[PDB]
């Protein structure tokens, strides 16, 4: 079949640079930054325990509850027990916040509390201060809002107003209450804060409050649980959690577990490898998970991320709330937290606790090796499962805090980093969420590790981070992690993709950031980049060039270092790189290197002139993007030598003269954007301020590549994409059209006189081209490009070429005619441009690319298979443009004074045949050398060759027709014509059909002779016929006379 031929066809001018408009992606407002870091400087521990005396309000049971801070007061005497409990509670708080000033008040007086609060406030005036209260030994707080404390003699409970208490304290502080009616305390505190606010006209949010119970509720009196339940939960969440678990009916699942076993559990709270540390780590992860899942992002950041102590207190507060719910006690927080006892994560917590403690009988008695709990492994597996289908912006996964927790250790660090990188690959929103959760400090600390296996994961993660947010450069410099990236980049064994990512990271680091630029200059980045400058990787070369250009951005030290390393000479090579992106990057780097001369010695002037001359030869570059970068570099050159260019311009109203001529050429560019930029830059010279400097978005455009996902399979490769199905449908239609055309050809050709339609155009039809498969005909006029239909018979679109009046559109071409076709428009001056969305209902005219060529009219012969483009005209040289590389490949000499009137080429062969005005027809073979390209040169006409077409068959016949109207059939393997014919004395235009040997001839007398190669008469249609075209497949003929009338003919 003919499907494989369509499949293996390169799609010219269809890539990221062509489809997507070149520009920088807008940076989102990243609020993930921590606003401030508060510290709990001092801790106040007020213990109104009243050992040995029961408060009159509550008559406790004979057993009652005797455990306060895991100490029995009655065992060691009243004062000794009070002091021991105070010291133990201080130790418990130090377990979470070791660095704090702890001052204990044991049954204090009002004056003592006042003095302590004033002293602590003076110690930390602008920092949070913890005020812990335990009113177990005093009556319940009054509705008026008072707290009972002891007098000097310990004979009467003296009340203490909450208003006075908060008067003594300042704004930044937190409060913890452990009493039966702490809800009353919270309500009174809020009411007094409101009263202060009302008074202020003629400190609520800053204050944080934790309550043991609701105002109506009372503390539990179960003998098994400690009386100091709320504080025990806030201080020893793991111990109280284990004790509470060993009281639930779930112990029936694991018999042989008792409180005695829980007491003798091995391990510490710091050693995570031990069972106790493992439980603590799992509990912290689960509590952070619940907090992030339930609470909103702002409150989550304000509470569980502001400081260590508050985060620990609330992570224990969630467990305290869950435990207290089972005893009809509702802990209360000043910022109202939505209830979290019902969250499913507590089931995972219970499962992990049961699994971990099931091994304790063997650990203590038999003494087995404690196996690590698989909880984190299972959670990471669930995160991976989510990532597998989590392409859509569905609900965020619940395991991001779990990933953050796993990143701390080493047992699962590599897998966690891999999964986090995969998650960040999803898109900018995922990376923003990861920044919100607080992954930045830990991934920053990961740079200190010297493990070489972490280098690819770390560089990928940081590449995504810098792609999303650019402010991390300062933090990277502060950590001195740029050395890590330099080491990664300076490793040839590292794969090219990760080295490209490292280069991108370093380029972002030094992006308009002086400190980073000089840090990397100290880091010998120029030499490292030069070492990996010629690496066989276009993306790597482009990004290394971008980074090198960014390093010397307004930094003379880097410029001098590059001069020592001769970076300019080594970078001249990339100007000829096949990839246009690499050429653009190199031009950007050279322009930036020029822009920071800052009036150095004559060596600087000489090297700058050399760079200018080297950049001057890139005018004949097909890519307008590279030409726009040339314009930016030349603007740098101008701003360096404004006086010289002003003098040169005033001269015309020898280096700067050539640069000014180059700027004139750039101004008269077919691309409107580049022409506008060049014209604006030139006008800035005339009226001679800094505002005239224009920076292209090429840098951020390239940076956007790392924002987009990469790890995923491309849509094109997928078999079931709608795009692939549409392409297959178009291929099937093309195959059917080809088969029908072949069937029509085999049946023969009959007389063609049917006129499908007759319409009038605003302008004279210059050249007409049919779309090979879709029914769209391109009719080019003097100042417009008309697109008609030979089936619907309606006008679709009316374009404007934009060329000057003197110039004229000579030819036309349909690039990628198989599917997603483009329109090639070649003017007679050299302006070649590409049109897209030319005959679509919901899209407007679009210009993909444009570039001046060369510099009869202009002749073009597109070759889709090889992707080569050739333009010819008055110049004695035939240029071979490569659309893949946007550069001329060969410039064969024509060896004739006359202009090239027509040109054609043979598929799968180098049989470039070019007609000439003198009458001679040359043929060139590009396989050999340029001087040997010419093969045959036979001269059998003296007139302008109307059309020197060539048949696509292997036995290609050159049917040359001149103005004399005499037909001669030449062959590439013969020095003389095989058939000679004379049809019309005066011929104006002619067209041939490769499939059907139908030579359509014109005539000044409205005659349209359609003969054969042998000269057999077929049709002489009776109406300056200057435009005829034949359909590539169907035997369709369009004839246009001097009048602006268009017709399409068909064989019945």
């Amino acid at each position: 079949e003919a499907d494989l031929t369509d499949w293996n066809l390169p799609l010219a001018f269809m890539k990221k640079r062509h489809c997507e408009k070149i520009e920088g992606s807008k940076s989102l407002a990243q609020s993930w930054r921590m606003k401030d870091r508060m510290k709990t400087v001092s801790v106040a521990l007020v213990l109104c325990l009243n050992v040995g005396v029961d408060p009159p309000d509550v008559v406790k049971t004979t057993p009652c509850a005797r455990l306060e801070c895991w100490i029995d007061p009655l065992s060691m005497g009243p004062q000794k027990a009070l002091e021991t409990i105070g010291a133990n509670l201080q130790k418990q708080y130090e377990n979470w916040q070791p660095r704090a000033r702890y001052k204990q008040s044991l049954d204090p007086t009002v004056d003592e509390v006042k003095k302590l609060c004033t002293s602590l406030r003076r110690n930390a005036k602008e920092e949070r201060v913890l005020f812990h209260y335990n009113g177990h030994g005093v009556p319940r707080p009054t509705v008026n809002g008072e707290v009972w404390v002891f007098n000097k003699n310990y004979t009467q409970y003296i009340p203490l107003s909450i208003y006075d208490l908060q008067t003594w304290m300042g704004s930044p502080s937190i409060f913890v209450y452990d009493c039966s009616n702490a809800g009353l305390i919270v309500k009174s505190f809020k009411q007094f804060a409101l009263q202060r606010e009302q008074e202020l006209e003629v400190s609520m949010k800053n204050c944080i409050q934790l309550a043991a119970c609701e105002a109506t509720e009372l503390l539990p009196m179960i003998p098994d649980l400690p009386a100091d339940l709320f504080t025990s939960c806030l201080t020893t969440p793991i111990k109280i959690a284990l004790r509470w678990f060993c009281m639930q009916k779930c112990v029936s699942l694991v018999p042989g577990v008792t409180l005695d076993l829980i007491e003798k559990i091995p391990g510490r709270l710091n050693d995570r490898r031990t069972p106790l540390g493992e439980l603590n780590w799992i509990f912290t992860a689960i509590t952070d998970t619940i907090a992030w899942n339930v609470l909103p992002r702002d409150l989550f950041q304000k509470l569980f991320r502001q400081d260590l102590l508050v985060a620990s207190l609330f992570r224990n507060f969630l467990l305290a709330e869950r435990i207290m719910r089972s005893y009809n006690c509702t802990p209360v927080s000043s910022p109202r937290l939505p209830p979290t006892y019902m969250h499913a994560m507590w089931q995972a917590w219970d499962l992990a606790v049961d699994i971990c403690l099931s091994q304790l009988p063997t650990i203590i008695e038999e003494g087995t090796a404690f196996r690590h709990s698989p909880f984190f492994a299972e959670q990471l597996t669930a995160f991976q499962v989510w990532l597998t289908m989590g392409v859509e912006n569905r609900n965020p996964p619940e395991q991001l805090p779990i990933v953050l927790q796993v990143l701390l250790s080493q047992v699962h660090r590599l897998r966690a980093l891999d999964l986090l990188g995969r998650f960040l690959d999803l898109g900018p929103w995922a990376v923003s969420l990861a920044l919100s959760v607080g992954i930045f400090p830990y991934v920053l600390k990961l740079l200190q590790s010297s493990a070489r296996e972490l280098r690819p994961l770390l560089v990928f993660i940081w590449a995504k981070i810098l792609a999303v947010d650019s402010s991390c450069q300062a933090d990277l410099v502060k950590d001195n992690g740029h050395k890590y990236f330099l080491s990664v980049l300076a490793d040839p064994y590292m794969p090219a993709e990760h080295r490209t990512m490292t280069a991108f990271i370093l380029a972002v680091i030094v992006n308009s950031y002086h400190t980073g630029q000089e840090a990397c200059l100290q880091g010998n980045l120029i030499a490292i980049c030069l070492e990996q400058l010629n690496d066989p990787h276009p993306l790597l070369r482009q990004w290394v060039a971008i980074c090198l250009g960014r390093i010397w951005q307004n930094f003379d030290s880097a410029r001098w270092c590059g001069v020592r390393d001769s970076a300019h000479e080594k970078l001249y090579s990339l100007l000829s790189d096949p990839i246009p992106e690499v050429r653009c990057a190199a031009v950007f780097a050279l322009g930036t290197f020029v822009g920071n001369s800052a009036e150095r010695t004559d060596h600087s002037t000489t090297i700058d002139h050399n760079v200018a001359m080297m950049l001057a030869q890139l005018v004949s570059d097909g890519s307008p993007m590279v030409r726009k970068e040339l314009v930016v570099a030349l603007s740098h050159l101008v701003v360096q030598y404004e006086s010289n260019f002003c003098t040169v311009a005033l001269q015309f109203i020898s280096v700067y003269t050539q640069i000014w001529r180059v700027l004139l050429h750039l101004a008269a560019d077919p691309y409107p954007e580049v022409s506008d930029v060049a014209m604006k830059v030139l006008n800035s010279i005339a009226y001679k301020f800094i505002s005239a400097t224009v920076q292209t978005g090429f840098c951020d455009w390239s940076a956007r590549y790392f924002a987009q996902p990469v790890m995923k399979i491309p849509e094109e490769h997928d078999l079931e994409s709608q795009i692939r199905k549409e392409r297959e449908w178009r291929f099937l239609r093309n195959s059917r059209v080809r088969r029908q055309a072949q069937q029509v050809i085999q049946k023969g050709i009959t007389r063609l006189d049917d006129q499908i339609f007759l319409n009038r155009n605003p302008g004279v039809p210059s050249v007409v081209k049919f779309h090979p498969f879709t029914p769209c005909i391109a009719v080019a006029d003097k100042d417009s490009i008309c697109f008609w239909d030979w089936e619907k018979g309606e006008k679709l679109d009316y374009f404007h070429n934009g060329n000057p009046r003197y110039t004229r559109v000579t030819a036309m071409e349909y690039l990628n005619g198989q599917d997603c076709s483009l329109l090639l428009t070649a003017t007679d001056d050299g302006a070649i441009r590409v049109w897209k969305n030319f005959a679509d209902l919901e899209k407007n005219p679009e210009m993909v690319t444009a570039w001046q060529g060369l510099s009869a009219g202009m002749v073009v012969d597109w070759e889709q298979e090889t992707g080569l483009l050739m333009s010819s005209g008055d110049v004695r040289i035939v240029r071979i443009w490569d659309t893949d590389r946007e550069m001329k490949v060969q410039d064969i000499p024509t060896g004739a004074d006359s202009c090239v009137t027509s040109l054609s080429c043979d598929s799968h062969r180098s049989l470039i045949v070019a007609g000439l005005g003198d009458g001679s027809i040359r043929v060139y073979d590009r396989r050999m050398a340029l001087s040997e390209c010419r093969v045959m040169t036979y001269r059998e006409h003296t007139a302008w060759v109307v059309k020197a077409s060539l048949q696509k068959r292997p036995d290609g016949h050159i049917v040359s027709v001149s103005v004399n109207g005499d037909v001669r059939i030449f062959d590439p393997r013969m020095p003389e014509s095989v058939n000679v014919l004379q049809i019309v004395k005066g011929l104006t235009a002619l067209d041939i059909h490769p499939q059907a040997d139908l030579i359509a001839c014109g005539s000044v007398n409205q005659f349209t002779a359609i003969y054969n190669s042998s000269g057999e008469l077929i049709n002489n249609i009776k109406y300056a016929i200057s435009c005829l075209a034949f359909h590539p497949h169907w035997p369709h003929l369009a004839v246009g006379s001097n009048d602006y009338y268009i017709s399409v003919y068909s064989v019945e």
């Binding site: 710091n270 991320r305 260590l308 701390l408 080493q410 600390k445």
Partner: peptide, 9 residues
Amino acid sequence: RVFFMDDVE
């Protein structure tokens, strides 16, 4: 910081 990170070299 907020969480203790071990085994970092």
